[model samples]
Target: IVGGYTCGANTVPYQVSLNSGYHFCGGSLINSQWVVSAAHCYKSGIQVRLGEDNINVVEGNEQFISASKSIVHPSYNSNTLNNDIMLIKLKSAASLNSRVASISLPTSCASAGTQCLISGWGNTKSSGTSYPDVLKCLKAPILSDSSCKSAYPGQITSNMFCAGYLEGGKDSCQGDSGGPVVCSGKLQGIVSWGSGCAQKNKPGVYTKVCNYVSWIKQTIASN
Candidate 1:
């Protein structure tokens, strides 16, 4: 649950689980057949599970689909963690229902201090190894670019932003990568990387989704 509270089923219909033998990351349904996630989470044999709250048991609403294509941003650099975003094209379009839906992308950048929600099935604690079976959610407040830069030094870039607590308590962990960071009902960021889970003066870093709207649209159009 990534150091957060248990989320009820259907709370976030756009949320999807990225599985490669096991649930390792989270993704957001951006369209009927497209999902957005972090580029760093890319791997072989990746599949997505929609309308699922629990990973251990398959529910009636669950829809598993193989990835037809996985496209990482051409400029993505693992060393610097810049432009850490990717898109997964599903083999078939997902059936939209009450339990499965797509999230809206942000048309503009989110203001600092905006309250956002992040959901995932990552580790419950920073040092823990066990991940929750059910989805989890946490409220994270966006930090200003200056503040985030101060904490991350040269690591923070224009394409990336920070969100979480300064004193430390709630944050995304190892398995929460590529999850959606929703603000005002729009997807504003993608969970990318962090210094450590819920550490003092260290907040979780995310790829700013608003900055790449044009690129995302172009990529989708071409594909």
Candidate 2:
């Protein structure tokens, strides 16, 4: 993530890296068998690596597993980038440990101005190619819907929210989509879209996870 620092080992146990040959997106383990990420990151043959820190090396606590199935939100729109959340079923349930654990889902929406932690292995720069080997994190507060609407006129919706600095600096960029935007120690948002990496007045937009909590529970129960 741009304007962030490297995270401590095993600090973000619920975080996972969606990969084929290398990391493409970040996700969070919601339970033993399910992972939450962005629908736009969806593709066939994705491998979920839980308890991951470094993307380039074999960490001892890593739980590399295959995706048995993936379900995209029925309302997901590629054209407008709305309802971008997704659920991935693991080939097998992950074995929870000090380094591999599940993160609780949000039951209610977070209010504006609540400070939260945003983590990922996205590019550290707005321009040029750079993806961190180690996961990075930034602490930013949630912005109001009015502010988000002001930033992206006619694009903001109730199902989405924006976070990060308006002056620009820290943000989740490429290779970090579908990752967690956590607040109050719960999953509040999912990295979905933005105009560019950490641009002024264009904060990173996320899937408002609180709007889909019931849908998520229903999907898991039926599947």
Candidate 3:
């Protein structure tokens, strides 16, 4: 399998390919009409694929969609990775197929301990030194605001939600950023940051969808 190193040995998971020379992490599908991905991904002209069993870039089974326009949060700061979230408006809606499906977005902010799922094509283990072409997923639980704040020490802003393996060794890596963190079967967040690819005490952080509800609605409405 083709693999690459990221986050100091972690492998690249998600599939974000552009033409033939460019590639990036895959973001999650929010609905048939929209996709939730990282601002950087959109800015870089990345492509997305969803609902595939194996990684290795299967173009036939996957549906390719062009981004009509990308809207990154106005407050997003690339340096700090703040408001790193972005939305991609597809040129056309995704067709309903068994291999591809849409995820729901949370109507409201979820409480701590809400079970969530994070999927990617990154590394299997921290410092594992391999990037699979296949997608992988893991189950995680939301952390209390206080717990997250304590872990990041004042960096856990209200716009971010933290979750991951407390003991470490499991998390989203470099290419995983901009990927989706699903909770309650709804699109809740996207991979944003971490101490360093699943390091101990450094949970994976994500953009809180609940905080940007109005912006998303209005942005799409205007278009």
Q: If scored against the real structure, what TM-score would every candidate get? A: 0.98, 0.98, 0.85
lDDT tens per residue, model 1, 1-223: 4558988997899999999999889999999989999999999788999998988898788999999899999999999989999999999999998999999999889989999999998888866577888899999999999999999998988999999998887899888899999999999999998887888898999999998888889998988
Q: What's the lDDT for candidate 3?
A: 0.68
Give the TM-score (vs. native) of candidate 3.
Answer: 0.85
- Which one is best on TM-score? 2
Off-target runs (Cα >4 Å) in candidate 1 are none
In the predicted model 1, the residue pairs found to clash are none
Q: Score residue 101 of candidate 2 by CA lDDT.
A: 92
What lDDT score goes with residue 20 in model 1?
Answer: 94
Candidates ranked by TM-score? 2, 1, 3
Across 1-223, the per-residue lDDT of candidate 3 in tens digits comes to 1122222112222223322143456576666767777775556454555454454656466667777777888898877777888887778887755556666667888779988777766656676566665566667789888878888996877788888766776677776677778777777888888887777888888889888878878887886
Candidate 3, residue 118: how far the Cα is off, in Å:
0.4
Candidate 3 Cα misplacement greater than 4 A, ranges? 1-22
Instruction: Please give the TM-score that candidate 2 achieves against the real structure.
Output: 0.98
Candidate 3 clashes between residue pairs 3 or more apart in a chain or in different chains: 12-121, 12-122, 13-121, 13-122, 14-121, 55-133, 55-134, 104-187
